[PDB]
């Protein structure tokens, strides 16, 4: 797994995951951006950045949030980071 | 889909009946994200293809057994799915979703 998914899990459930939240947890873990959402998110970053300053997880989270209008998961952020990497955009 | 979640949720409730403490997040995520390597997928599909003729749709049980022999431990839902998907890429009759 990616390090930030584990970080995301500690952030979301700082004192443990109670059994009443198992469905919510797994549903969130399963969630991903559609191809069209990944295109829009990467586009949004490219529109707002110069290609020198490395793009941060926070930058990507904000771009994705604006698009899906809800708190992004680590997996969603990573889809966009991957896409930006495919066009050589610097990543933090 | 619904069945994927049914299966993982059933597993989670059984493995962690009183909750998942933060010390077990590493182990939990490792299991949830565990996947067959490409070469393991190839080997599973090949063993299944050798022992079936299409008159009997490949079941979850068929795939589970094939993957178990390869990885030498109980296969997860995602590992089973990877093989079902590979089999579907050659149009092999499947009982299970993908």
Q: What is the number of H-type helices and E-type strands within chain B?
A: 5, 0
A18-A22-A27 Cα angle (round to 5): 145
Tokens coding B52: 């079936």
Domain that holds residue B25: 1-36
Shared-domain flag, residues A72 and A43: yes
First and final CA of chain B: distance in angstroms?
8
Nearest chain A residue to B17 by CA: give it: A19
Q: How far apart are CA B56 and CA B39, in angstroms?
A: 25
Closest listed residue to residue A26, CA positions, set B55, B76, B80 = B76
User: Domain tally for chain A?
Assistant: 2
Shared-domain flag, residues B5 and B30: yes
Cβ within 8 Å, pair B5-A30? yes
| Distance of residue B92 Cα from the nearest chain A Cα, in angstroms | 26
Q: How far apart are CA B41 and CA A88, in angstroms?
A: 31
Method of structure determination: X-ray
| CB of A25 closer than 8 Å to CB of B5 | no
Question: What CATH number does residue A86 fall under?
Answer: 1.10.10.2390
Tokens coding A53: 């300053």
Shared-domain flag, residues B9 and B54: no
Q: Kindly report the number of other CB atoms within 10 A of residue B16's CB atom.
A: 16
Shared-domain flag, residues A73 and A56: yes
| CB of B98 closer than 8 Å to CB of B59 | no
The number of C-alpha atoms within 13 Å of A28 and in the hemisphere containing its C-beta is: 17
Tokens coding A29: 């873990």
Cβ within 8 Å, pair B19-A19? yes
Sign of the Cα pseudo-torsion (B14, B20, B23, B26, in order): positive
Closest listed residue to residue A80, CA positions, set A48, A39, A49 = A39
| Closest partner CB to A22 (pick from B13, B22, B30) | B13
Shared-domain flag, residues A29 and A44: no
| CB of A59 closer than 8 Å to CB of A80 | no
Which residues 1-40 of B are in CB contact (within 8 Å) with A? Answer: 5, 8-9, 12-13, 16-22, 25-26, 29-30, 32-33
Shared-domain flag, residues A75 and A63: yes
How much of chain B is helix, strand and coil, in % rounded to 5? Answer: 65, 5, 35
Shared-domain flag, residues B43 and B30: no
Shared-domain flag, residues B75 and B30: no
Q: Kindly report the number of other CB atoms within 10 A of residue B80's CB atom.
A: 22
| Closest partner CB to A6 (pick from B13, B16, B26) | B26
Contacts of B9 in chain A (CB under 8 A): 22-23, 26
For chain B, the maximum distance between any two Cα atoms, rounded to a whole number of angstroms, is 48
Q: How far apart are CA B81 and CA B26, in angstroms?
A: 23
Q: How far apart are CA A15 and CA B89, in angstroms?
A: 43
Q: At what resolution in Å was this solved?
A: 2.0
Closest listed residue to residue B94, CA positions, set B68, B64, B65, B56 = B56
| CB of A12 closer than 8 Å to CB of A43 | no
Shared-domain flag, residues B68 and B87: yes
Instruction: Assess B59–A contact: CB distance below 8 Å, yes or no.
Output: no
For chain A, the maximum distance between any two Cα atoms, rounded to a whole number of angstroms, is 45
């Amino acid at each position: 797994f990616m390090d930030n998914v584990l970080g995301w899990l500690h952030k979301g459930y700082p004192e443990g995951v109670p059994p009443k939240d198992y469905f919510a947890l797994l549903a969130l873990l399963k969630r991903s951006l559609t191809e069209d959402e990944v295109v829009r998110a990467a586009q949004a970053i490219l529109r707002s950045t110069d290609g020198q300053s490395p793009v941060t997880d926070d930058d990507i989270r904000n771009a994705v949030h604006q698009i899906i209008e809800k708190e992004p998961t680590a997996e969603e952020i990573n889809q966009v980071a991957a896409r930006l990497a495919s066009v050589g955009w610097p990543l933090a």
